[PDB]
Amino acid sequence: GLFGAIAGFIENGWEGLINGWYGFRHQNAQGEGTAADYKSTQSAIDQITGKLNRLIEKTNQQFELIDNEFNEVEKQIGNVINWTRDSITEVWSYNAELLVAMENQHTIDLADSEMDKLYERVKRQLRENAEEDGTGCFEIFHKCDDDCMASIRNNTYDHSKYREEAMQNRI
Amino acid sequence: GLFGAIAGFIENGWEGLINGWYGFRHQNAQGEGTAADYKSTQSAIDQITGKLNRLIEKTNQQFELIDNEFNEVEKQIGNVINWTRDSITEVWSYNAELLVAMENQHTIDLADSEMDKLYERVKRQLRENAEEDGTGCFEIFHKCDDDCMASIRNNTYDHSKYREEAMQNRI
Amino acid sequence: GLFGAIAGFIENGWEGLINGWYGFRHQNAQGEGTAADYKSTQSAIDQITGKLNRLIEKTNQQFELIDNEFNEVEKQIGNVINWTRDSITEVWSYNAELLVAMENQHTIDLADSEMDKLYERVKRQLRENAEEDGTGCFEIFHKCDDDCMASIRNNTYDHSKYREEAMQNRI
Amino acid sequence: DKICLGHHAVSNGTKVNTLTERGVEVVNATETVERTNIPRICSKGKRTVDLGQCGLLGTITGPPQCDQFLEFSADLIIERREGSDVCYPGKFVNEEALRQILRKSGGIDKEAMGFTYSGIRTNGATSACRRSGSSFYAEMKWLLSNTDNAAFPQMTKSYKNTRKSPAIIVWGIHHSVSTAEQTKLYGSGNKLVTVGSSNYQQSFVPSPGARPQVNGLSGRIDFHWLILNPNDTVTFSFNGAFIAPDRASFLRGKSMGIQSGVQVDADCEGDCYHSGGTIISKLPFQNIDSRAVGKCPRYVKQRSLLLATGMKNVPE
Amino acid sequence: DKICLGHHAVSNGTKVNTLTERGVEVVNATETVERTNIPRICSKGKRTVDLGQCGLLGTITGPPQCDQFLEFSADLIIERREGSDVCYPGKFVNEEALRQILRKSGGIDKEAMGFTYSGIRTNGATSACRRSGSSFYAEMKWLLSNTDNAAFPQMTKSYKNTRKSPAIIVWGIHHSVSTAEQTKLYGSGNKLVTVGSSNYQQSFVPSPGARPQVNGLSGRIDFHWLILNPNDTVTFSFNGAFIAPDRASFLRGKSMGIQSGVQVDADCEGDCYHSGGTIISKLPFQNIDSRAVGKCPRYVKQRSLLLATGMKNVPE
Amino acid sequence: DKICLGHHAVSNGTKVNTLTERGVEVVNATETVERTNIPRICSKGKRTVDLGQCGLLGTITGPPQCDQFLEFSADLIIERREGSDVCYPGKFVNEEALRQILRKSGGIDKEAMGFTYSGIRTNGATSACRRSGSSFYAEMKWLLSNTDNAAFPQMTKSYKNTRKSPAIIVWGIHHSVSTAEQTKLYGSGNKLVTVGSSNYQQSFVPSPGARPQVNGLSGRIDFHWLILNPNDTVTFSFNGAFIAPDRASFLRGKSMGIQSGVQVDADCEGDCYHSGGTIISKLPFQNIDSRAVGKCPRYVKQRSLLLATGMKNVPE
Numbered sequence A, B, C: 001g002l003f004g005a006i007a008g009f010i011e012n013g014w015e016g017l018i019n020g021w022y023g024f025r026h027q028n029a030q031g032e033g034t035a036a037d038y039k040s041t042q043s044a045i046d047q048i049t050g051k052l053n054r055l056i057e058k059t060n061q062q063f064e065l066i067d068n069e070f071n072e073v074e075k076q077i078g079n080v081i082n083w084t085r086d087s088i089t090e091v092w093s094y095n096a097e098l099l100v101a102m103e104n105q106h107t108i109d110l111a112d113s114e115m116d117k118l119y120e121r122v123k124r125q126l127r128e129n130a131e132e133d134g135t136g137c138f139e140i141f142h143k144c145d146d147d148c149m150a151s152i153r154n155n156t157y158d159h160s161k162y163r164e165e166a167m168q169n170r171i
Numbered sequence D, E, F: 001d002k003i004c005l006g007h008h009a010v011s012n013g014t015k016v017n018t019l020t021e022r023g024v025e026v027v028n029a030t031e032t033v034e035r036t037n038i039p040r041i042c043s044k045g046k047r048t049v050d051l052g053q054c055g056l057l058g059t060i061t062g063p064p065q066c067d068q069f070l071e072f073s074a075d076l077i078i079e080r081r082e083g084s085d086v087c088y089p090g091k092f093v094n095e096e097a098l099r100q101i102l103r104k105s106g107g108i109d110k111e112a113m114g115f116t117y118s119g120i121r122t123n124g125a126t127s128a129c130r131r132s133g134s135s136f137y138a139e140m141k142w143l144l145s146n147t148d149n150a151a152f153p154q155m156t157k158s159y160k161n162t163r164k165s166p167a168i169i170v171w172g173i174h175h176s177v178s179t180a181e182q183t184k185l186y187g188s189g190n191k192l193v194t195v196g197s198s199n200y201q202q203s204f205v206p207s208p209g210a211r212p213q214v215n216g217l218s219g220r221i222d223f224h225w226l227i228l229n230p231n232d233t234v235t236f237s238f239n240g241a242f243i244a245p246d247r248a249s250f251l252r253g254k255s256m257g258i259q260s261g262v263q264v265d266a267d268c269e270g271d272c273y274h275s276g277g278t279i280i281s282k283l284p285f286q287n288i289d290s291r292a293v294g295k296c297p298r299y300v301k302q303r304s305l306l307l308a309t310g311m312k313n314v315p316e
């Protein structure tokens, strides 16, 4: 995992969340509902996109033939050229395999980061009005209607509005 | 540290924990006791092992002599060969030193991750029945016998069983 | 971000904190005040410095001319030399650009780590006598004078001293 | 009441490799190694010369296969397997170096060197160099004794490089099939061709003898060359067996030369070639041809290396 | 009451390096650079030829040191410092290229080229190539004028490569100790050997004159070679001083050739050799010999590079 | 009451590049690619020879430009663009190989080869090699027929390498402006110089004829060389047109050779040179000269690559 969220305390992800990478799934009086978090999604996409823009890019270094495929060059220089080329092929094959492995490990860890980042943002919005259930959910210890859930999502939820209600419910 | 656990808020580790990389140390009525967490250990070992399987591996690229150790080659071509070889030796020496340094930094950070991951899993299992003491321990605010400790370890601990006991003890 | 602190839940940094990389900013009865945390600063500096000591270092590999700027070499061998050199320049240009990019990504993430590490150290010192406000601050639910703040900073704050005061104030 | 955090997933992710695992499923990934070839020379936007049956070195000497290309001009030069530098059998001394020059040359511009001759014929021909019947290399002159077995008069001819650019100068040394036939063409006795600029002094003796038939002939004209700098003179001292240049060659600009077995296509535009066609790709690596040239991705051994562009896939 | 989290440690960890620190103790670590040599050529499972006193190039010409290897067959070819390509003093021209070919060849198969001769002797020998007394290179023929000072008749001999594989063709040029002794063996006047395939035209003159004694002789036979492709002919035009091939050499398949100073050992199995022995290792890097060959770890300068296989070691 | 965690920032950070972004502002950063040149050859602590007008190869032959360097000794050898290996026009055959040797040589020590001569003059000179008027190459002898048009007696001269180190042996072949002037200096008929050690046998014919004037002369002396191993002899058989060595050259030790256009400076100390001066830097990379030599940072294309030494800068 690293960060411990994806493939971790969040056992499994959601095939039905299709407007984003991360999202919320609530349950209240009016019933269940699902919505994607744009900001955390756009943060991950922007960062992965940045890796892509860095690799998908123009080598402007021209190379020319030193070799001849039709009328073969002198055997000694040819063998040096072949040895030299093969040596460089080893280098680039290594450089490429490692780049990808390293980039991939980071890309997985980065996406895990943005999940942990969002979970802990919500945890903090809820102050002492909720409790971590251990699986990626908060037991919201007060009544939270469709407008209130929306306040959690768009980062306007005022905890001191529901604190007294929740303090009480927690006992 | 990164992640902040090993060589961080957990000042130092345990020479007596020998059945694993991570583990628990409780103190209750029946007395002190120490046990290793298999799952978090196997997660770290599997990942480090994966780095090992990736490096301990067969280059199947054949190289042949271009040079001669008994009767030395023409000086000009030899000097080019020597220059070319030495240049590639620089490359591989760099690639090797960096690989190890980068791999090692990640291996340390990864092991730190699995510690933080385990601490935060336990924290969550304990809900409002415990408190972080700051050194890697939880003040369990209720009586927790050898069967109960085992429930924390094997991830079966039911917080709502001890909640009322603990709420009360916390004041 | 990774870790989520710098350029994250801590909206922006402080141009007036000049004795360190990380620091505290309190508000109490006697008024606002700002101080740097030496230990977390020195941890980051030491680690970045370590990257610097690893790169700012002596290649002891001698290379000699194979080429001639005044009386140009035979065209065939010259073209091989030029091809070989250009190929190695590609390799080092790649190796250098990647090193810096990788090092920089890590340096940013590492500095983010030491921030998260310090925030969570304080959170733990405060036990149940404070609450995370979400922006990098703690609502300290008890009176905390300039001597008490100093105890938080130099890691001597005893939570059980203010616990009863704060439990009560939280309701 | 309750709210849950989560993340997307898909039923069938793509397996990729990491520092720690082989084959972890992630949501989306993308290829990093190009395997897609375009099996044509994508020549759009460059003056392209397909040399066909003309061997690139033949552009200097001018056997008949090369009549269209004697003053060719190009950004991209394509040599073909069927090309031959030669009508009357022979080879160039220091051949590949000269090709490397010419591939880079932008094409060639010819100047007359203005050699005229008296006391000899200036017009040897052969049925291996066919035009309207027996001809020769267009840029050279097969210098012969006036009549069979006559003395070839000891000659000197010189060309000064009038121009700003340095010049390619060619000559040939005719290695007759027998000392008999050497005497017949250029008379008796030792034959010496000497050549000198200021950078260069060297000397050539023919070495007549049987060798296997190529276009029916067993003689050989091996061709030699030098680079004659601005304001420098080249001087040919000779008494027969000498294939004299009529024209010097000058380089026009820059070009890129490839060797290829596939069609030109002026509608597709590209900058990385190999014999099997063109590699058009923004990807950093390619597994198509290790010998490819132009502005190319780097050749790597591996056929596929997938870069994760999405998180871990964690389904049900 | 209480529960604590923690992690293992050991009294004496291993120091390793990271991006940020030099020499941090971690629990366990392992070596990544191979230094362990096996000081024998680990030949198990491959047909191995220890050339001993036979120089690899001698397998083509066949001086006596090489009589056992004239048609050798191998997966691994081992050259020794004591090997010599030669009985009558001389050298191969373009020698290292030919070794690179032969090291790769799988061994060699010989065909007769079927040159017969009249008007000359076909049987020069020398006491530098001893068998039952004065002999020569087994695969060659020392062509001499019929009797002291007689004319060597201008000859032409040709061999077509009938076979599927390309062929190695060898000849020698005898450099007699004086124009006196050259005249004695092959008669008077200039001596010219010309050689040509379709890929190849070149010409050889002996160069007689004083030089110090080597194995007591002052003459020299330098050897030359070319690669003759399938269905192509090679033609030798000559009038003396020529060491003619009797047999052509054909390559059998593939091999790997090393130069070594240590024993063969058919009980140990390996794929990376150098003169000091074999490198058997799964490690990615080696600090043993920068010139090692086969399927090897990469040579690096560094003697040790330790890879952490455990967490930070943090004792009390 | 309240306590806030936070971190420093600055109004104007420095943009750097990461895996994920181009141009992120961080607090402090530092350069990783060296661009700062020191435009002098930092020669401190090493015996440095600035060859000025002496071409490095001239140290062996000894034209006047090289009289100070005939037995030079050095750790660093600096060739200049104005250097010339030559007084009487000509060139060295296999010139660049010899420079590579001499650049590495530590300098050279001369031994007499002890050739004396009778029946010829031993003292040809020319006004192209001026000392107090017409002189020659100091280490060589221009051997002439006793008087105009006289026969040059067929000679043999031999030098054994008495010493522990292998030796550089030089000779020249004079290419006279016409067969007229060749006859005048060395008499009539074919001219043959033969040279042989045990490793080496070869032959040189002058090749007289018109060629353009260089320092006003149209003749040429091209110079040849071989490496004569310990206890081995080199033997010169010749009948004129031969420029004989007086002294052999032996290598002293080790050195590093550069080519440069700028001043020496024995007060600044360095180990990475190029023609534009010295690169003194602890940085891992340099964008100064791809051809630089000694112990250098690696050449990279990029002019700047900034390494972050601080956190993200996040201002207001």
Ligand SMILES: *[C@@H]1O[C@H](CO)[C@@H](O)[C@H](O)[C@H]1NC(C)=O
Pocket (backbone or CB within 6 Å): A075, A078, A079, A082, D290
């Ligand atoms: C060089 O490599 C090519 C293919 O990559 C091969 O076909 C060729 O024969 C090799 N050259 C020599 C001299 O072994």
Ligand SMILES: *[C@@H]1O[C@H](CO)[C@@H](O)[C@H](O)[C@H]1NC(C)=O
Pocket (backbone or CB within 6 Å): B072, B075, B078, B079, B082, E290
């Ligand atoms: C080239 O490399 C080896 C050292 O690895 C050395 O023994 C050899 O003689 C060197 N050649 C030259 C020409 O300096």
Ligand SMILES: *[C@@H]1O[C@H](CO)[C@@H](O)[C@H](O)[C@H]1NC(C)=O
Pocket (backbone or CB within 6 Å): C072, C075, C078, C079, C082
């Ligand atoms: C090789 O490049 C150098 C500069 O690196 C240039 O000055 C030289 O003449 C080039 N090569 C050829 C074959 O002309």
Ligand SMILES: *[C@@H]1O[C@H](CO)[C@@H](O)[C@H](O)[C@H]1NC(C)=O
Pocket (backbone or CB within 6 Å): D230, D231
């Ligand atoms: C060529 O020759 C003339 C001298 O007559 C001179 O004016 C011209 O500038 C010269 N330049 C070069 C580059 O050869």
Ligand SMILES: *[C@@H]1O[C@H](CO)[C@@H](O)[C@H](O)[C@H]1NC(C)=O
Pocket (backbone or CB within 6 Å): E230, E231
């Ligand atoms: C060789 O010779 C015969 C024709 O006479 C033919 O069948 C065969 O294909 C030829 N080709 C090659 C590549 O040798």
Ligand SMILES: *[C@@H]1O[C@H](CO)[C@@H](O)[C@H](O)[C@H]1NC(C)=O
Pocket (backbone or CB within 6 Å): F230, F231
């Ligand atoms: C050189 O010459 C003499 C032999 O007469 C001897 O003492 C010396 O050791 C020789 N050896 C070598 C390897 O040059």
